[PDB]
Structures are given as structure tokens and as C-alpha cells.
Design a protein around this ligand. Structure first.
Ligand code: A1ANZ
Length: 169
């Protein structure tokens, strides 16, 4: 079956959320698009990007280095479409701002706007974790910006509960 997402909670007509590891979701669902929480040089050294790359047995990193050689780095707020490998048909590498490294939080709207070029996506919560954005703010920007169908996988039950409670206020 195609895009067989299971156990998500529907927040709006186009945003769904689950307490799950995005890697495990991608292996099970094999969505049309999986979003990577990338950096501008597509160096998948840890966190979500390192976990997605390891699940491809480093094929994503080799492909990413070849893309950077020919095209140069992305911009913060920008994206590129590369292979999904064994995880999806495509991987949309999206650069959210890293607030802990001084980048502008307003670029989070530009980052989520990349999602609107794809009908259905499996994605992480952009700029959360060690990128330093307030995760409740990142969910509000996602809900206000994305118009296509997005399935958010958040791998932390404590944060999942805080995000759902924050949305349902
Ligand atoms: C907020 C947090 C809960 C969330 N984390 C995650 N959200 C969704 N899916 C996730 N998988 C993993 C993961 C990390 C290590 N190893 C893994 O797999 C190893 C076991 N397998 C072999 C069974 C999976 C983490 C993760 C998240 C959201 C956005 C960002 C980050 C973190 S960040 O990486 O800190 C910076 C970039 C933006």
C-alpha cells in the first residue's frame, strides 16, 4: 500500500502527528517523500540526519557530497530533492535555522514552505532538538504554513504530549 501511515493523530485537515522515530516510520511506510532536517553542506553527522543516513548504509551521504560538488551549498530556509534510497521515493533535504548558532528564527517559515511542492510528506519537527527553536513555535509555523499533507514523527513521548496539549488549548 502507498503512504500507509498508521496511528497518527490528525491536528488539522492537513497536519498529522505521531510519537515515533522517523527512520522506523520511513522503513514501514516507504512514503513518497521523507524530509531530512539537513544543514547547508548536507553533512549528516548526527541527530535526525545521521540516523536517516545510517539507515541508507551511507548511500545518502555519498549522493549528498556529489550534489554539493556540482551545485554548492544550500541556503538556510532552502531545500533540494535527492533520492529516498530504501526509505522513500525521494528525500527532501530542508535546512531550518539553527538558533543555537545565531540563525534567524523567521527562516523557519521559508523552511516549511518547501514542503508545499510535495503532496504527501513524512517529516520531523524542523529546527527542534539541538537546532534550538522552541518546538511549540515550530509546530505552530508548520500548521500555519504547510498546505499539503504532512505526517510529523516526533521521537519523544514527553514532547509529543506537550505539543498535542499546546495545539488543543
Ligand atoms: C525533538 C526531537 C525529539 C527530534 N528527534 C527525532 N525526531 C524524529 N525521529 C527521530 N529519530 C531519531 C534518532 C536518533 C538517533 N538514532 C535513531 O535511531 C537509532 C535506533 N534504530 C537503529 C533502531 C533515531 C531522532 C528523532 C528532533 C527533531 C528535529 C531536529 C532534531 C531532533 S536534531 O537532530 O536534534 C537537529 C535537527 C532538527
Amino acid at each position: 500500500e502507498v503512504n500507509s501511515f498508521s496511528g497518527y493523530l490528525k491536528l488539522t485537515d492537513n497536519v498529522y502527528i505521531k510519537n515515533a522515530d522517523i527512520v522506523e516510520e520511513a522503513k514501514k511506510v516507504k512514503p513518497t517523500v521523507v524530509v531530512n532536517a539537513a544543514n547547508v553542506y548536507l553533512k549528516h553527522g548526527g541527530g535526525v540526519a545521521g540516523a536517516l543516513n545510517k539507515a541508507t548504509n551511507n548511500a545518502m551521504q555519498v549522493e549528498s557530497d556529489d550534489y554539493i560538488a556540482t551545485n554548492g551549498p544550500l541556503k538556510v530556509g532552502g531545500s533540494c530533492v535527492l533520492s529516498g534510497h530504501n526509505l522513500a521515493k525521494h528525500c527532501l533535504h530542508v535546512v531550518g535555522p539553527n538558533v543555537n548558532k545565531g540563525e534567524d528564527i523567521q527562516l523557519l517559515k521559508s523552511a516549511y514552505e518547501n514542503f508545499n511542492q510535495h503532496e504527501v510528506l513524512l517529516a520531523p519537527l524542523l529546527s527542534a532538538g539541538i537546532f534550538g527553536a522552541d518546538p511549540i513555535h515550530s509546530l505552530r509555523v508548520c500548521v500555519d504554513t504547510v498546505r499539503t499533507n504532512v505526517y510529523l514523527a516526533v521521537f519523544d513521548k514527553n514532547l509529543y504530549d506537550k505539543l498535542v496539549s499546546s495545539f488543543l488549548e
